[PDB]
């Protein structure tokens, strides 16, 4: 199970994102003089859409793709029976937990981290490439909370242009858009924009803006118009920004051309 | 849903409709066209003269092969390939 | 060898076996005349498929050309290739059936069976080995869809073994030549899902498609949508002709396309269909044929793929070519639409391969396609019949032959059946 | 003197026979029509009392084409008329139509014909049986054949080269069935057994040789170079010459267990050799790599159990044992804990021949590897998930049993790849 690791020295301990096939374990390492996280994937236990007609999508992703503020990892190797580990690099927080260390993030500092972020967001759609799964437990940030780095890089498709649309619908409720979930194609760019919306909005309003505990009526409300939580202060553009990245219409929101250059991110 | 209502339908040269596609058949480049005589000289564009050139050419007849697709022009081919060809045996094990 | 036997019924029957005579003799390059004048070994290797042969270095069509009105065969012995089919295997009744199944199936069928029984057993002890038969005619006819479904009975029976697949003609909702159209296809279908090994729908309406827009042709007359079902059918059979990277047959593909025994009505395609203009910019190339193909636009029948379920799909190209972007792009096709393909069978598509390509053309394919979106055809049909005989319309000519009305009751049963166990499938 | 049956069945066998024996002729000389211009033949090619070399092999299809082709082609005066058997109906991807009602006609003038050229064999050392699980008569058809050849020659060793199907890439919808309902007959009735898929070709020539559109002449040459190098410790002489039995009986040391797998080395054009310097090193390095393997399967998931090397052209028994430590010395490479000693070096003389018209580059040294691991059993685990899928809702069953299998088998033949998955699991658990 761990021996071929323990050759190189990886007893991980310290158990960071607990889940059935899939841990955040801190490492340690010998080759590269310090720390590592280490993502189990179980290629038996786990289910096939994991295991098979998936797993190639998200471990390309994992090897081609190179930017500042993404996943660097190191390699890949594995035990013998049948398992999969995965070495990637240095890691400290995801934004979820240090949302929660202060409640949210005053919006100095989160323009700062929503432009570091939405600038990650350009380079993922220039190179023909989607994420679909973009979340504050996924949203990971630096020891110093000052730098962004997204992850979860589960639900990789070759995107090119608007003539085909996607069909499968892949993605969480708290994160998700009626053309997943109302059962019509979508333009797999315009759902991963949208999927800034809502992690713009949890970030400093503290709450997801709808409920995702009821699956119809999510979409029935989410025509009602978006709603802030009252005490809480923006800016103009961003009232705006959320406003154009939680609307109904699938292309009426910005892509990754407009989504890129804002004038309160600029500012 | 069949688009055809009560229509212009008359002659290509004209140039309405998908009279481009009408050019592009092999009865409209084989008719002849008559050399330009007396007058002319007033009817002529910038274009015709500054940015293009004109020059009387020949017209011929054409060779007859096989249509498959209703608009098969296999005439207006390259002269190569239009025979038969060779199993991948004969062209590899020869 | 595997030999084939070309049966005919019906005005429509007839037009269309004439042009596909005329497509398979270029292929073999053989004369008006009867005399072979191609130029390769191999074009004059297999000749004994279709031709059978003849003195003289003569070649004639193993050809059954039968209709119950006597006008047509004027018109096909006057045409260009007219004087290659033998006068002896033009079994003609005296008379027309108007338009009625009935007096085909029973009436004036019953007689002139024995003629076509007659011509096609001696064809069969012709040949060696025969592969089996295949008969196109329209089911909206009076012959074709009457004495042809009276045919098609028979043969089972004495040859139950040999395969049959029927090139036919279905009735288009919009373009309806005649108002007793529901009575006989109801009436023939009802024969076909019970003797057809594999049924290949073709609509003059979805013809009028592919003219208007892939080949924007502006006056398409009958003997262009002729010869697209004539495309259709030398492609399905081009890798039996001739020898290829990787061979199939009638069989190959016939065992390859149907999961049970009711489910054998496909949608056939061609490849290779491009405007005068288009022959600028392009380039032959496999990844082109392949988009070309599944775009719903090019299908040969009245329903789009897009609202049903892809059960098998069968792809014979011809031509000279390299395997895995073949292989590679019907992964791509298959991952890409997942939605569209059922997901209890991995690996939907097949793939047959014959190096000879059609003649002055370097690279073309066939595509034969089995998809839940055919049972939208059936609804609609059952739609318009029922709307008529729930008012006893029309009918004392149908049971002016002594036929009764359960077996009208019967006929829309298994129709509703059909497409009762065709949509637990989806 | 030791002797080769060749017994390709189906369209892929006899496109195998003709890339091998097109290879083989060009080594030794021999001219298309027959005679060498100028007695190592005598494994393979056997004289007439004309003076012309013969091959001992026989190739059997359903369907006349393919055959008629090679009796048309430019090797219609090496082959006789005889060895060339065709069916006028094929089995057409059916399992049931290639064992019960065409074969039947056929096995008997088949196996006339076997006979007849054993009985022209001295000292027959065996058979080498080339064909595809995917294809009905590749399948049923050698599946019967291999029952009664079993009782006519208990003792021969029988071995298999096969086309496995490819676990993204198929040719068929009701392949698997056929796949399943042949491992019965693979597995009692084959002593070591050779699976390739296509698709770790494909990805071998885009990935090595930089040929774009390979078609299935150039994967057929590969395979020929892979027979060619098992083959060449009979044909020529060499330090360590290996004939068939050695590495069968260390290759296999279960009876349910014989199902090694190919690999080859050095794979490179022209353009590439011209610049890279080739040692034994080089290629054992490039031999142990999982991008180098002809089935979709990685070793490093595992446990490799028995490893035979073929080393062929100007190979040093020192750079053979260096190569060996420096594959034994790796963590990467793990070895099972009842097999300390695992490899099986073979040495021979004769540098690998390139054929015009090839692909490969002409090298001075070849090594060939059979290399029986554990791996290989998530392949059948994969088949089997597609089987069950495809039997719970009883697809394409009624062919089968119209032509006369009943359906119980299909369960049977299930249970018994379930129980050989059981049983790699089996050996795969440690001694201790
Ligand atoms: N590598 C390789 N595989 C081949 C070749 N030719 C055929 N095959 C394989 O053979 C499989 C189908 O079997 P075939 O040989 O075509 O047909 P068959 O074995 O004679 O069985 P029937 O179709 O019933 O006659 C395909 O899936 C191919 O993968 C070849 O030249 N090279
Ligand atoms: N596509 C096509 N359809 C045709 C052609 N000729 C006739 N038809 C169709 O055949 C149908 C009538 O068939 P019919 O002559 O009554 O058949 P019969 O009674 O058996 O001889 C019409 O609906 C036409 O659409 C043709 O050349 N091409
Ligand atoms: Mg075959």
Redesign the interface.
């Known amino acids: 199970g761990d021996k071929?690791l323990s050759?190189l020295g990886y007893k991980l301990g310290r158990t960071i994102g607990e889940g059935s096939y899939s841990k955040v374990k801190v490492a340690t390492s010998k080759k590269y003089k310090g720390t590592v996280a280490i993502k189990v994937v179980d290629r038996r236990r786990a289910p096939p859409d994991f295991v098979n007609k998936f797993l190639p999508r998200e471990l390309s992703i994992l090897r081609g793709v190179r930017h500042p503020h993404i996943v660097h990892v190191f390699e890949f190797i594995?035990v013998?029976?049948?398992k999969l580990y995965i070495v990637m690099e240095a890691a400290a927080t995801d934004l979820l937990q240090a949302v929660q260390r202060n409640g949210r993030i005053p919006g100095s500092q989160a323009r700062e981290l929503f432009s570091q972020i939405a600038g990650a967001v350009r380079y993922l759609h220039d190179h023909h490439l989607v994420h679909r799964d973009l979340k504050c437990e996924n949203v990971l940030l630096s020891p110093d909370e000052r730098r962004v780095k997204i992850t979860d890089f589960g639900f990789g498709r070759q995107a090119h242009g608007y003539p085909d649309l996607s069909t499968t619908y892949c993605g969480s409720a708290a994160y998700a858009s009626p053309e997943v979930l109302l059962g019509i194609p979508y333009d797999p760019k315009k759902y991963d924009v949208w999927s800034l919306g809502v992690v713009l909005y949890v970030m400093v309003t503290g709450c997801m803006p709808f409920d995702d505990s009821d699956i119809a009526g999510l979409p029935r409300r989410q025509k009602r118009g978006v709603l802030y939580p009252d005490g809480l202060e923006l800016s103009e553009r961003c009232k705006s920004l959320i406003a154009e990245l939680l609307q109904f219409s699938p292309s009426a929101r910005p892509s990754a051309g407009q989504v890129a250059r804002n004038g309160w991110l600029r500012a | 849903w069949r688009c055809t209502t009560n229509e212009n339908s008359y002659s290509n040269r004209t140039l309405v409709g998908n009279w481009n596609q009408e050019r592009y058949d092999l009865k409209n480049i084989v008719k002849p066209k008559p050399l330009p005589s007396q007058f002319g000289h007033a009817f002529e564009t910038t274009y015709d003269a500054n940015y293009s050139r004109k020059k009387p050419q020949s017209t011929h007849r054409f060779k007859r092969e096989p249509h498959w697709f209703p608009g098969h022009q296999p005439e207006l081919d390259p002269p190569h390939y239009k025979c038969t060809a060779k199993?991948?045996?004969?062209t590899?094990?020869? | 060898?595997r030999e084939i036997v070309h049966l005919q019924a019906g005005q429509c029957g007839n037009q269309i076996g004439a042009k596909f005579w005329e497509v398979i003799s270029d292929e073999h390059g053989i004369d008006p005349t009867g005399t072979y004048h191609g130029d390769s070994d191999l074009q004059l290797?297999?000749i004994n498929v279709y031709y059978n042969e003849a003195t003289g270095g003569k070649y004639v069509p193993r050809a059954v050309l039968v209709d119950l009105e006597p006008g047509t065969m004027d018109s096909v012995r006057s045409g260009p290739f007219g004087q290659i089919f033998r006068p002896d295997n033009f079994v003609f009744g005296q008379s027309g059936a108007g338009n009625n199944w009935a007096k085909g199936h029973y009436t004036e069928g019953a007689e002139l069976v024995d003629s076509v029984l007659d011509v096609v057993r001696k064809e069969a002890e012709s040949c060696?080995?025969l592969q089996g038969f295949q008969l196109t005619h329209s089911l909206g006819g009076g012959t074709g869809s009457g004495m042809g479904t009276l045919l098609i009975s028979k043969i089972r029976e004495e040859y139950p073994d040999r395969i049959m697949n029927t090139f036919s003609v279905v009735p288009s909702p919009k373009v309806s030549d005649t108002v007793v159209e529901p009575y006989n296809a109801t009436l023939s279908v009802h024969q076909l899902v019970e003797n057809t090994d594999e049924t290949y729908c073709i609509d003059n309406e979805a013809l009028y498609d592919i003219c208007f827009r892939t080949l924007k042709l502006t006056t398409p007359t009958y003997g262009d949508l002729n010869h697209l079902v004539s495309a259709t059918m030398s492609g399905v059979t081009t890798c039996?002709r001739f020898?290829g990277?990787?061979?199939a047959?009638l069989?190959?593909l016939?065992?390859?396309?149907?999961?049970?025994?009711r489910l054998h009505f496909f949608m056939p395609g061609f490849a290779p269909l491009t405007s005068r203009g288009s022959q600028q910019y392009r380039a032959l190339t496999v990844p082109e044929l392949t988009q070309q193909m599944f775009d719903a636009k090019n299908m040969m029948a009245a329903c789009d793929p897009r609202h049903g379920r892809y059960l098998?799909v069968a792809a014979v190209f011809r031509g000279r070519?390299?395997?895995?972007?073949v292989?590679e792009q019907m992964?791509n096709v298959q991952n890409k639409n997942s939605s569209y393909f059922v997901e209890?069978?991995?690996?939907?598509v097949?793939?047959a391969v014959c190096d000879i390509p059609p003649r002055g053309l370097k690279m073309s394919a066939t595509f034969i396609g089995n998809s839940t979106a055919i049972q939208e055809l059936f609804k609609r049909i059952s739609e318009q019949f029922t709307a008529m005989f729930r008012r006893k319309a029309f009918l004392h000519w149908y049971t002016g032959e002594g036929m009764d009305e359960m077996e009208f009751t019967e006929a829309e049963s298994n129709m509703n059946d059909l497409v009762s166990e065709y949509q637990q499938y989806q | 003197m030791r002797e080769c049956i060749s017994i390709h069945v189906g369209?892929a066998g006899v496109q195998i026979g003709?890339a091998c024996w097109?290879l083989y002729c060009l080594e030794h000389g021999i001219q298309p029509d027959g005679q060498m211009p100028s007695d190592s033949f005598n494994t393979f090619f056997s004289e007439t009392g004309a003076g012309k070399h013969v091959p001992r092999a026989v190739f059997v299809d359903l369907?006349?084409?393919?055959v008629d082709?090679?009796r048309?082609?430019?090797?219609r005066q090496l082959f006789h008329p005889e060895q060339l058997i065709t069916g006028?109906?094929?089995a057409?991807?059916?399992y049931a139509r290639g064992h019960y009602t065409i074969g039947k006609e056929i096995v008997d003038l088949v196996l006339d014909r076997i006979r007849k050229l054993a009985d022209l064999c001295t000292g027959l050392q065996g058979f080498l049986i080339f064909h595809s699980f995917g294809g009905?008569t590749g399948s049923g058809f050698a599946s019967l054949l291999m029952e009664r050849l079993s009782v006519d020659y208990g003792k021969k060793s029988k071995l298999e080269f096969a086309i496995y199907p490819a676990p993204?890439?198929?040719?068929?919808?009701?392949?698997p069935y056929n796949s399943i309902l042949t491992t019965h007959t693979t597995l009692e009735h084959s002593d070591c057994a050779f699976m390739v898929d296509?698709?770790a070709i494909?990805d071998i020539c885009?990935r090595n040789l930089d040929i774009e559109?390979?078609?299935?002449?150039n994967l057929n040459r590969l395979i020929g170079q892979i027979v060619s190098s098992i083959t060449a410790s009979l044909r020529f002489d060499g330090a360590l010459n290996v004939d068939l039995t050695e590495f069968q009986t260390n290759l296999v040391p279960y009876p349910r267990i014989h199902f090694p797998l190919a690999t080859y080395a050095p794979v490179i054009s022209a353009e590439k050799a011209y610049h890279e310097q080739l040692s034994v090193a080089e290629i054992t390095n490039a031999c142990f790599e999982p991008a180098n393997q002809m089935v979709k399967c990685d070793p490093?998931?595992?446990?490799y159990m028995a490893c035979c090397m073929l080393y062929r052209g100007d190979v040093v028994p020192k750079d053979v044992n260096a190569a060996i430590a420096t594959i034994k010395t790796k963590?990467?490479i793990?070895f099972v804990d009842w097999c300390p000693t695992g490899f099986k070096v073979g040495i021979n003389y004769q540098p690998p021949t390139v054929v015009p018209?090839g692909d490969l580059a002409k090298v001075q040294r070849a090594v060939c590897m059979l290399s029986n691991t554990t791996a290989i059993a998530?392949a059948w685990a994969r088949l089997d998930h597609?089987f069950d899928?495809?039997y719970?809702?009883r697809?394409?069953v009624?062919?089968y049993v119209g032509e006369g299998m009943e359906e119980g088998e299909f369960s049977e033949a299930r249970e018994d790849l379930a129980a050989l998955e059981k049983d790699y699991e089996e050996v795969?658990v440690d001694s201790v």
């Not at chain 3, 016939?254 to 025994?261: D, E, G, R, T």
């Open positions: 071929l050759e594995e013998c029976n049948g | 199993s991948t045996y004969m590899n094990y020869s | 060898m290797e297999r060696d080995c039996l020898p990277q990787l061979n047959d069989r190959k016939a065992v390859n396309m149907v999961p049970f025994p098998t070519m390299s395997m895995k972007e292989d992964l209890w069978i991995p690996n939907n097949k793939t | 369209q003709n097109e369907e006349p084409t393919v082709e090679v048309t082609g430019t090797y006028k109906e094929d057409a991807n059916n009905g993204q890439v198929s040719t068929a919808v009701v392949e296509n698709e494909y885009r559109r390979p078609t299935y002449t490093r998931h595992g446990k963590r990467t793990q018209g998530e597609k899928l495809m719970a809702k697809a394409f009624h062919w795969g």
